[model samples]
Target: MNIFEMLRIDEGLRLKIYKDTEGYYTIGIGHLLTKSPSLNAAKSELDKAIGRNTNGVITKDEAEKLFCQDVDAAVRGILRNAKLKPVYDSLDCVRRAALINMVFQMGETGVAGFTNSLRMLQQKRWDEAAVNLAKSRWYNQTPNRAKRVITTFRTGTWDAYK
Candidate 1:
């Protein structure tokens, strides 16, 4: 089945925030409950969703399946952006997976925001792309992952570790 279908199958769903098996407060499929400084409204919306369970019991999986469409759209954006370069198409499968993976983690907008990185990749400057990728904030977020991506970028291919 599809990813959303799989996610729904795995996460189940509920309107109220329920502590998952892993000890996280989650709701509406797999949306984890975290206090983001900028998303109070969303937090509050989640707040309204959770309460003393006064709403009722025997809950339904009120998960946001539609919300997952954003991922598909984001992936599509990645496909379109990468299609401009034949070199991209000719990369190792692992490298191609890495590109899709970057877009997946960052979302289409975040990936697009990497102007320097994209430019470097577009020009088939693997080392430059690797350098730019390593220098990015996303790299800072996950040094080990950046290292793997850099390996592929530098080699213009992939290996098992990546």
Candidate 2:
């Protein structure tokens, strides 16, 4: 499976705005409205994108569009990082896509914080990387998703794709 496929399962689809596990305003497959400057601005932009006053609702096509944009941003975020770019370039598609999914969940800066884990990943030390990933608050906060992502990183396979 591709990165989008993996992310589609992990992120899931939600046409209506809802609070995420961390209580952030989120919609359209985990696209974070909280990242936008304010809640009002986010809602307005959502309304404009959907071409109507959705009142916090969006169509499947609109959600897909947002999903694509978010994924693109995540991918670009990984590539733009000086340390991550080389690690990303060294991997095959599956591993590279896993990094994109990671960036999607935690942003580039968050992923970059996994210094030791990234070092292990860069060296292709899958087990070490997985162990490092588990020893974090991210694992505690989102255990299931974190497990899947870590497994994907360790195995370099789509077995975790649900």
Candidate 3:
């Protein structure tokens, strides 16, 4: 599947603020509002985003805008990292998307921690890369999404999902 469709399906669009799997206050295709220490503090930021006085609902267009912005930020963050840039540049489009997807979920710093995986990817060792990815806590937390990404990287093609 294409990146847009893959992310939309993976994130599951929600106009209203809701707790993510890790209990962070999230909304609009996994846009994290804040990581406040208190629930009150977190909800306050969520209210600030969706508006306190108004209903906690955002338009589909608004969600799409947020998704695009987050995706762009993810891409820039990955490209900005010195260690990642060369590997990213060496990758084909499909493999690049797999990396972007990982960064989108894990953040630039988080993905950067995958030293072995990064090395495997840099060396064009697809199976080794996938094995490294699968052994991570990220894969355990989000197996299906991780599987799709791993398959995409391993096969060097768009992920095939039914």
lDDT of 1 by residue, 94-145 (tens): 4565665555445567777777777777677887788878887777866765
Report the C-alpha lDDT of model 3 over 1-162, residue by residue, as the tens digit: 667777787789998777887887777998887776566666677567655542556778777878998899988998899878888999998888888888888788998889999999999999988898899899999898889889988998874545
Locate the minimum summed-lDDT window of 10 residues in model 2: 33-42
TM-score for each of the candidates: 0.51, 0.91, 0.89
- Assess candidate 1 and give its TM-score to the true structure: 0.51
- Winner of 2 and 3 under TM-score: 2
Off by over 4 Å in 3: 37-40, 47-55
Q: Which candidate is the best by TM-score?
A: 2
Model 2, residue 129: C-alpha shift (Å): 0.9
Assess the local accuracy of residue 5 in candidate 1 as a C-alpha lDDT between 0 and 100.
41
Candidate 1 vs 2: which has more TM-score = 2
How displaced is residue 100 in candidate 1, in Å? Answer: 0.7
Candidate 2, 6-118: lDDT as tens digits: 88898889998877788777888888877554668778767876678988889888899988888888878777899789889988788898889888988899988889998
Off by over 4 Å in 2: 35-42, 48-51
Candidate 1: residue pairs that collide: none
- Model 3: how far is 13 from its true place, Å? 0.4
| lDDT of model 3, residue 32 | 83
